[PDB]
Amino acid sequence: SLLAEFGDPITRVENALQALREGRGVLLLDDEDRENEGDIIYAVESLTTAQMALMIRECSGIVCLCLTEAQADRLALPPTVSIEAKHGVTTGVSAQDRVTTIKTAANPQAKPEDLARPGHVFPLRARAGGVLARRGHTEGTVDLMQMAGLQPAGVLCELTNPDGSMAKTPEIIEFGKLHNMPVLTIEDMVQYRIQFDLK
Amino acid sequence: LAEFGDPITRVENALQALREGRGVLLLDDEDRENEGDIIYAVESLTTAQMALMIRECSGIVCLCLTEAQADRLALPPTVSIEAKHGVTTGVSAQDRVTTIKTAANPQAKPEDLARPGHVFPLRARAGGVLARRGHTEGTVDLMQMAGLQPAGVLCELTNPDGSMAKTPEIIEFGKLHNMPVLTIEDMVQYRIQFDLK
């Protein structure tokens, strides 16, 4: 309903995947309900300091790194977890330092000793099966990267209005227009995967 | 930094701002490379103050507690907490304030909080900055020195480009927002001048 003007569910997914392939962000909701809160999602593959600075300044600041089970295992993460790059940072909290931690953690060549614990980035493991197993934003983030053909890691953070209230669907739509970020839902992603990923 | 006064004045002005319900900015010492934090008293914390921290700071807002209060909450001797009641998704400015008030309540019980959550509590060492020169200790000490509920919130100030605000930029922010700036060293010197028998 509230998103129909922006394409049917599969079209909304396709537009989001293309934005990610072009290095741009997307906005993710559970479904079309007017009371949902939403997250900015960026691909790790193309993540820049400027994107992270925007995410921190527009969102809750509790930036989460969504990883596959295999990648989290590579880092020896437990099966709140927080991480910092051991090298290449100063105090860890700046936009640039968080990007360094994120790239270090998501690198398929990473070793546990590349990271210190605790830190300022919060990694989360996506369940096997993605949104077809668990309709979480962690699964949504990793699935979008895989569906787009990108490094299977993304960052997410909750969009927060300047007055401190959380952006709901109507305010998410307006942010997506202001920043040219496609809006899609987990429900849309399920519909896409049921159509294209099943025998 | 001396635009904020001599070191004793810097402490007195910070204490008075907190008594008035306003925030302050804290650095380790006068060195130009230090990065600074906004501090607010829990006793007077508002949604608008929390909203400012989320807009201006890292967003990883920490709640600094006494050892006694952390023991009352059964916190471990990253920890995150959420109010069990009175919140929705926990992340809005209002919900974080609810969690903070619930956690800092002198009559709190462990089950008043869920874990994990969106507020990050830290235990101040007994003795405050005279035992450990951390910003957690600085926060709790300021509240005690000001005669307030001994709990405060802390978050690292950013610059508009996403870098962290260092001393020169902290000084300019304090002027713009009428927030006193002080250092841990200022606090140590003050407490040794005035807090010892």
TrEMBL record, chain B:
Could you cite one Gene Ontology molecular function of this protein?
Answer: 3,4-dihydroxy-2-butanone-4-phosphate synthase activity
Record's SUPFAM superfamilies?
Answer: YrdC/RibB
Q: Which GO terms describe its cellular component?
A: cytosol
Q: Where is this site: Essential for catalytic activity?
A: 118, 156
Annotated binding of D-ribulose 5-phosphate, by residue: 32-33, 37, 132-136
The residues listed in the UniProt record as binding Mg(2+) 2, with positions renumbered to this chain, are 33, 135
Q: What is its EC number?
A: 4.1.99.12
Report the superkingdom from the record: Bacteria
Give any single GO term for biological process: riboflavin biosynthetic process
Residues bound to Mg(2+) 1 are 33
Alphabetically list the UniProt keywords.
Answer: Lyase, Magnesium, Manganese, Metal-binding, Riboflavin biosynthesis
Pfam families linked to this entry: DHBP_synthase
Q: Which cofactor does it need?
A: Mg(2+); Mn(2+)
Query: What Gene3D superfamilies is this protein classified in?
Result: DHBP synthase (3.90.870.10)
Q: In which pathway does it act?
A: Cofactor biosynthesis; riboflavin biosynthesis; 2-hydroxy-3-oxobutyl phosphate from D-ribulose 5-phosphate: step 1/1
Q: How does it assemble?
A: Homodimer.
Q: Which NCBIfam families match?
A: ribB
**Family, as annotated:** Belongs to the DHBP synthase family.
Query: What function does the entry list?
Result: Catalyzes the conversion of D-ribulose 5-phosphate to formate and 3,4-dihydroxy-2-butanone 4-phosphate.
* PANTHER family (UniProt xref): 3,4-DIHYDROXY-2-BUTANONE 4-PHOSPHATE SYNTHASE, GTP CYCLOHYDROLASE II-RELATED
Q: What's the protein here called?
A: 3,4-dihydroxy-2-butanone 4-phosphate synthase
